C-alpha cells in the first residue's frame, strides 16, 4: 500500500482511523496515528492487506501511537486532499491564528485555524492534556489523520471533537467547533522517529 496521510486503515478487522504521517525509525518504516486507535500489537490493514502492527501508543494522558510497517510498504511524503496531495516539508509548529487543514477518511480534507493550545479533553476514558484546538471540522473515522499547513508543515494527528448526532462537527459554525489534535513534535522525539519529507 502507498502510505499517504489521511487514508483509511482498520485496526484488528474492526475500527477505522486515518494515517497521520510516514516516518522512519532507522531502517523501519512507520506512520504516526492516534493512540486510541489501537493497542500495542493490534493489526493495521489497508485495503484488506496487513501493513503493520501498533509498536507503541499512549492514550489517555496523551493520544499518540506509531505503526511499524512491513518493508513492502511505500512511505510517501504526502497528505491526501481529494485526488491531489500536499507535500510534507517539515514540522514547524504554527501559532494560534494560523490556518491549518486536516485530512481523514470520513470528512476528507478540511481547513480552519488554530484557535487555542494546551487544551484538556475529558474523554470517557480519562483526560488527554496538551492538545491543540483548531476549528476545521472532522468526524468519527478521522482520528489519527494529518493536520498540516498548506505550506507543508506537519502539525499533528487528530484526537477528538465535539461530535453531533451526525457523527461529525461540520453542520455547526466554525465558531462552535472544537476539533483537537495531538502535537507531532513530542511524538517524534518520544519514539525517535524521523518524518519523511519531499
Amino acid at each position: 500500500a502507498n502510505i499517504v496521510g489521511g487514508i483509511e486503515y482498520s485496526i484488528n478487522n474492526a475500527s477505522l482511523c486515518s494515517v497521520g504521517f510516514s516516518v522512519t525509525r532507522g531502517a523501519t518504516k512507520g506512520f504516526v496515528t492516534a493512540g486510541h486507535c489501537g493497542t500495542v500489537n493490534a493489526t493495521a490493514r489497508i485495503g484488506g492487506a496487513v501493513v503493520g502492527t501498533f509498536a507503541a501508543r499512549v492514550f489517555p494522558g496523551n493520544d499518540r501511537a506509531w505503526v511499524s510497517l512491513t518493508s513492502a510498504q511505500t512511505l510517501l511524503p504526502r497528505v491526501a486532499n481529494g485526488s491531489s496531495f500536499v507535500t510534507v516539508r517539515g514540522s514547524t509548529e504554527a501559532a494560534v491564528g494560523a490556518a491549518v487543514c486536516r485530512s481523514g477518511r470520513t470528512t476528507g480534507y478540511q481547513c480552519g485555524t488554530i484557535t487555542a493550545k494546551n487544551v484538556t479533553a475529558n474523554y470517557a476514558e480519562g483526560a488527554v492534556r496538551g492538545l491543540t484546538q483548531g476549528n476545521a471540522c472532522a468526524g468519527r473515522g478521522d482520528s489519527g489523520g494529518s493536520w498540516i499547513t498548506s505550506a507543508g508543515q506537519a502539525q499533528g494527528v487528530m484526537s477528538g471533537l465535539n461530535v453531533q448526532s451526525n457523527g461529525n462537527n461540520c453542520g455547526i459554525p466554525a465558531s462552535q467547533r472544537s476539533s483537537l489534535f495531538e502535537r507531532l513534535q513530542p511524538i517524534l522525539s518520544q519514539y525517535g522517529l524521523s518524518l519523511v519529507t519531499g
Binding site: D63, Y123, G160, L161
Partner: peptide, 4 residues
C-alpha cells in the same frame, strides 16, 4: 469532546 470525544476521541475517535
Amino acid at each position: 469532546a470525544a476521541p475517535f
